[PDB]
Design a protein around this ligand. Structure first.
Ligand SMILES: Cc1cccc(Cl)c1NC(=O)c1cnc(Nc2cccc(C(=O)Nc3cccc(N)c3)c2)s1
Length: 287
């Protein structure tokens, strides 16, 4: 983890306790300058807040993959402390899709999912269980590359008392596998369930999983065997894959390597994506 000197960081604009800014980072001993995102931790933070803040950077610094947000470094010796990452111009994937409804091709959407799956395969192979995979935690750059974010020590430390929470609130249950909800059994296979929900988010341009259903209503539906219906204009192969991510039995779910492989094969033979799942309709009746 690279300690960055504050003289190398300028903040240009607020984009999101503390704040998140867009800024510039001078690197390579003053010879290079790159756009960055900058998250601060304001004075008065608690020990827990510090350990969680620097812990997310420490975890991010362990990864090096095209589909995982890249850490530039941290400012810990000066205040306010900062975490500095690459800047993703299009922000969170759920909002991005909700502002771009219907504008992408099926192949583009499937390619986004392949990138997310590659990042998740990498995480799982590192023995990192994400526990909060959702489109809100995926960022998108100007070239439409999707990268996983949102990391924390409660996911790796042994029997961490906060392992079942978000990086401190309740993990929104509608992305979470039944065995993680009911028994706190979070594993890469529960991340696969979440990935299936992300596939549905992507193919619907950011629809809310399960619409108006309350959390208890979602639990009722899933435990009765209900599953989210196909998105509109969705390839049958893509819907079949998300259904397999949602198998009740975790051992029946695909591994991330399987997901990456299948998505690759579909993209490479794109006629395979022209078979669409039937969209289950409202009754509008005309001649
Ligand atoms: C700095 C940091 C510390 C710890 C964890 C993480 Cl993941 C990060 N990094 C970031 O939070 C971010 C990296 N890149 C970000 N980009 C971002 C976030 C929110 C909004 C925007 C933005 O400007 N979105 C936008 C603006 C205009 C048009 C479109 N399509 C999208 C861009 S936020």
């Amino acid at each position: 983890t690279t300690e960055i000197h504050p003289s190398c960081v300028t903040r240009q604009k607020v984009i999101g306790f503390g704040e998140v800014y867009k800024g510039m980072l001078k690197t390579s001993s003053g010879k290079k300058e790159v756009p960055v995102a900058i998250k601060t931790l304001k004075a008065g933070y608690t020990e827990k807040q510090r350990v969680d803040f620097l812990g997310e950077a420490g975890i991010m610094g362990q990864f090096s993959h095209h589909n995982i947000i890249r850490l530039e470094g941290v400012i810990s010796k000066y205040k306010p402390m900062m975490i500095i990452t690459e800047y993703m111009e299009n922000g969170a994937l759920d909002k991005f899709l909700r502002e771009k409804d219907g504008e992408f091709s099926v192949l583009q959407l499937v390619g986004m999912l392949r990138g997310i799956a590659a990042g998740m395969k990498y995480l799982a192979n590192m023995n990192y269980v994400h526990r909060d995979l959702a489109a809100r935690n995926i960022l998108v750059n100007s070239n439409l590359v999707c990268k996983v974010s949102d990391f924390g020590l409660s996911r790796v430390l042994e029997d961490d008392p906060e392992a079942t929470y978000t990086t401190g609130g309740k993990i929104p249950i509608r992305w979470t596998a039944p065995e993680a909800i009911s028994y706190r059994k979070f594993t890469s296979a529960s991340d696969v369930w979440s990935f299936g929900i992300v596939m549905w988010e992507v193919m619907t341009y950011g629809e809310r999983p399960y619409w108006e259903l309350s959390n208890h209503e979602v639990m009722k539906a899933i435990n009765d065997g209900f599953r989210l219906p196909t998105p509109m204009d969705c390839p049958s192969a893509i819907y079949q894959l998300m259904m397999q991510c949602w198998q009740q039995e975790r051992a029946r779910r695909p591994k991330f390597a399987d997901i990456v492989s299948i998505l690759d094969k579909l993209i490479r033979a794109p006629d395979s994506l022209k078979t669409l799942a039937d969209f289950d309709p409202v009754s509008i009746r005309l001649p």
